[PDB]
Design a protein around this ligand. Structure first.
Ligand SMILES: Cc1ccc2sc([C@@H]3O[C@H](CO)[C@@H](O)[C@H](O)[C@H]3O)nc2c1
Ligand SMILES: *Cc1c(COP(=O)(O)O)cnc(C)c1O
Length: 810
């Protein structure tokens, strides 16, 4: 079919077909007369899975033999999505399987749609971890992803009456063919108990035990025969647990609830005990596994030379005191030596500066759940502050500002401070974010240990985010520059010499048009909503949050609508405005924004005068699999967070790599994207970080914008009067109130420039040729945003290991 999808050899197509039938029969226990599409999907999944095992076994045997430094990526989230196609792509089996299933009279694409998304993440943070695993495998690093095997991942979103309804993501219902339970490696995790101080050392006793059972999932590198491992822990109650009899057995649920469900909060800290248990659970089991693997390879001096632990934000921050606990209490190392090892082993990555997202655990919680860890944290704080006091004599405020322990209503432990103190490297996820860390939130820490602070701008894997989701684009690109770019995205720059190539311009635009037609079709298939494929696809997909400002997008949509109603017979570039994303269940304002979006669509989509000139659609249940479909079909990417709030963003990179132009603020990675492509090829608008600060010093008064902008005033009055909610006139009173009196994200402040910028977008879209040429300039300079580049920097500048593009014998 198409080049980049590999060869469809005679022998291997034949082999695939027989193994497919072999699995349908022996594995699924079905025949062609009673098999359902799902059975066929599993037969294929198992057939592909078989090609992984050989490589998986030798990759691990390889690491045992060579004993390289091991990288442990600890995260509470891994947003993997579907695994079938990704596996075929990395094993160069896509065309062969496509052919084999074709000959069996089956449509492989239909079968791929049956696989459930592995949604063990909320959004960008979990997706980053998934892209990172892909890149580490592709770069030949002996890396392991460690997390929790949630029984229920991010909830499936249903839109009822325009309101978000959540329903359990029972992703394991039909089983998971990709994982391999490893019950033989089960480890005990301790909770509660008390600390006993004996002759030689302290002892943590009278604890309640929960077993951690690991499940391994293979992570194949891109065509290098490397298959790494993602190990996810599942909670299991010991058998003597609580041992009326019946009740004791039913109460096992209490212990196993630890790995039951993913907390659905994106950029928001919820200090619940269950969450703390999850954090310790993943940390405790992982560290024991790490140490056990090390002892094989008694003197932990070399521990840092053979182990690197990366903390994905503070969620797994307990790894620092847990490592100290094990080394001091169990291995009997002196404190100072244990600390040296811990710091040299741990590295911390911060992903946000939003105050409500930072973890600050109540001391009383740690006191009851992890008594020994609290003592260790106090000791760490004591020694850390002595260092601060020695470096800044007499600066008592610095002492209280840097303390890991925060005083006040209830004493809390600042996990971020803990991470900085116990790590040899701390990094932000985009240049501007890392600078903000050094200038604001972590300024005191940067002044004490400037050497620790680094930047590692995020990235996305070009395998899933280009080859897999946009084969048509990957193909026309391969046609001109070869396939090498798939694992060396910088090579896309060569496309710059085709910016004036008429054939290429035509192909780029053709691929986009095809993606839009395919998506427009999908919308009618699974959701029954008609849209015009000739319109500009204006899309904003990401979690619903005030800082991401879906509300600013909404104001623009209403502006466009009001302008059309004012001058109906005036021409305007047709637009299909698509907004999608999930709101955390307890985030009221986020849920109201979703309702506002659907309410706007209700009015706009049924107004006869508007016609097919403007359509507002809310993409339901936005997740990884849906991102793979809508991003390749997008023309305009909305990355409009208030400057200084989106640490990096990654959706922005996906859109850039897939041929969409970007309208956004100078926030997060947007700054570097504009820098790489050139500001003239980016639709930048709004306040920069400095402008936001100037406004805060002066005091943000929304009323001022309302009084000086007639169009804005009209919108607010429409919202307040019930124009978008006839039966419930004051339905959006909370939204208006917030916008007018307590908008922490200054939506009104960027309104004018945003609308103006949006006009420049429409202007360019009217010139197909020039729009496409600008698109080419974006795609051609998106190379820096490959997670391979990001991982290579982590490897060389933090973990101290060299990436390799060497194939392993398959
Ligand atoms: C829970 C707590 C904190 C964050 S920061 C975060 C996200 O992580 C991404 C990867 O670096 C960044 O690109 C985003 O800007 C950030 O908001 N997600 C969460 C979820
Ligand atoms: C890439 C991705 C994200 C992150 O998007 P941003 O716009 O950076 O917040 C969130 N959700 C899904 C499903 C993604 O694929």
């Amino acid at each position: 079919q198409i080049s980049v999808r590999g060869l469809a050899g005679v022998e291997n197509v034949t082999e695939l077909k027989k193994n497919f039938n072999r699995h349908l029969h022996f594995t699924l226990v079905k025949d062609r007369n009673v098999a359902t599409p799902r059975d066929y999907y599993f037969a294929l999944a198992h057939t592909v899975r078989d090609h992984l095992v050989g490589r998986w076994i030798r990759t691990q045997q390889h690491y045992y033999e060579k004993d390289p430094k091991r990288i442990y990526y600890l995260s509470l989230e891994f947003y993997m999505g579907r695994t079938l196609q990704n596996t075929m792509v990395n094993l160069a089996l896509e065309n062969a399987c496509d052919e084999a299933t074709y000959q069996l009279g089956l449509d492989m694409e239909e079968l791929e749609e049956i696989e459930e998304d592995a949604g063990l993440g909320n959004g960008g943070l979990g997706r980053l971890a998934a892209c990172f695993l892909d890149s580490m495998a592709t770069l030949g690093l002996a890396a392991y992803g460690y997390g929790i095997r949630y029984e229920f991942g991010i909830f499936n979103q249903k839109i009822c009456g325009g309101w978000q309804m959540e329903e359990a993501d029972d992703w394991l219902r039909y089983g998971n063919p990709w994982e391999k339970a490893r019950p033989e490696f089960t480890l005990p995790v301790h909770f509660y108990g008390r600390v006993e101080h004996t002759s030689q050392g302290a002892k943590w006793v009278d604890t309640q035990v929960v077993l951690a059972m690991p499940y391994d999932t293979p992570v194949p590198g891109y065509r290098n025969n490397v298959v790494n491992t993602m190990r996810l822990w599942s909670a299991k109650a010991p058998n003597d647990f609580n041992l009326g009899y019946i009740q004791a057995v039913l109460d096992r649920n209490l212990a196993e609830n630890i790995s039951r469900v993913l907390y659905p909060n994106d950029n928001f800290f919820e200090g619940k005990e269950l969450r703390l248990k999850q954090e310790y659970f993943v940390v405790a089991a992982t560290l024991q596994d790490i140490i056990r693997r090390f002892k094989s390879s008694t003197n932990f001096d070399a521990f840092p030379d053979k182990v690197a632990i990366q903390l994905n934000d503070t969620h797994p921050s307990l790894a620092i005191p847990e490592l100290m606990r094990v080394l001091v209490d169990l291995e009997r190392l002196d404190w100072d030596k244990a600390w040296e090892v811990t710091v040299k082993t741990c590295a911390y990555t911060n992903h946000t500066v939003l105050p409500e997202a930072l973890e600050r655990w109540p001391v009383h919680l740690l006191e009851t759940l992890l008594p020994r860890h609290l003592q260790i944290i106090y000791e760490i704080n004591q020694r850390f502050l002595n260092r601060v006091a020695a470096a800044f004599p007499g600066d008592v405020d610095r002492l209280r500002r840097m303390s890991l322990v925060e005083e006040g209503a209830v004493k809390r432990i600042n996990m971020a401070h803990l991470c900085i103190a116990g790590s040899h490297a701390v990094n932000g996820v985009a240049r501007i974010h890392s600078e903000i860390l050094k200038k604001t939130i972590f300024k005191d820490f940067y002044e004490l240990e400037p050497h620790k602070f680094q930047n590692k701008t995020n990235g996305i894997t070009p395998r899933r985010w280009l080859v897999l989701c946009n084969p048509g684009l990957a193909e026309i690109i391969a046609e001109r520059i070869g396939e090498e770019y798939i694992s060396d995205l910088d090579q896309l720059r060569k496309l710059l010499s085709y910016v004036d190539d008429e054939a290429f311009i035509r192909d780029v635009a053709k691929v986009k048009q095809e993606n839009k037609l395919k998506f427009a079709a999908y919308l009618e298939r699974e959701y029954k909503v008609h849209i015009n494929p000739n319109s500009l696809f204006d899309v904003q997909v990401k979690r619903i949050h005030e800082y991401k400002r879906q509300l600013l997008n909404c104001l623009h949509v209403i502006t466009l609508y009001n302008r059309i109603k004012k001058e109906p017979n005036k021409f305007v570039v047709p637009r299909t405005v698509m907004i999608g994303g999930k709101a955390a269940p307890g985030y009221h304002m986020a849920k109201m924004i979703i309702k506002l979006i659907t309410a706007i669509g209700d009015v706009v989509n049924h107004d006869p005068v508007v016609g097919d000139r403007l359509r507002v659609i809310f993409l339901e249940n936005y997740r990884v699999s849906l991102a793979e479909k809508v991003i390749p079909a997008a023309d305009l990417s909305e990355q409009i967070s208030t400057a200084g709030t989106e640490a990096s963003g990654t959706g922005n990179m996906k859109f850039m790599l897939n041929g969409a132009l970007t309208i956004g603020t100078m926030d997060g990675a947007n700054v570097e994207m504009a820098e790489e492509a050139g500001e003239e090829n980016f639709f930048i608008f709004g306040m920069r970080v400095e402008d936001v600060d100037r406004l805060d010093q002066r005091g943000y008064n929304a009323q001022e914008y309302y009084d000086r902008i007639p169009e804005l005033r009209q919108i607010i009055e429409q919202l307040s009067s019930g124009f978008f909610s006839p039966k419930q006139p004051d339905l959006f009173k909370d939204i208006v109130n917030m916008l007018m009196h307590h908008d922490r994200f200054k939506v009104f402040a960027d309104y004018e420039e945003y609308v103006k910028c949006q006009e420049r977008v429409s202007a360019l879209y009217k010139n197909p040729r020039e729009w496409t040429r600008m698109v080419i300039r974006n795609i051609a300079t998106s190379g820096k945003f490959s997670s391979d580049r990001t991982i290579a920097q982590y490897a060389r500048e933090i973990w101290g290991v060299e990436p390799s593009r060497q194939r392993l014998p398959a």
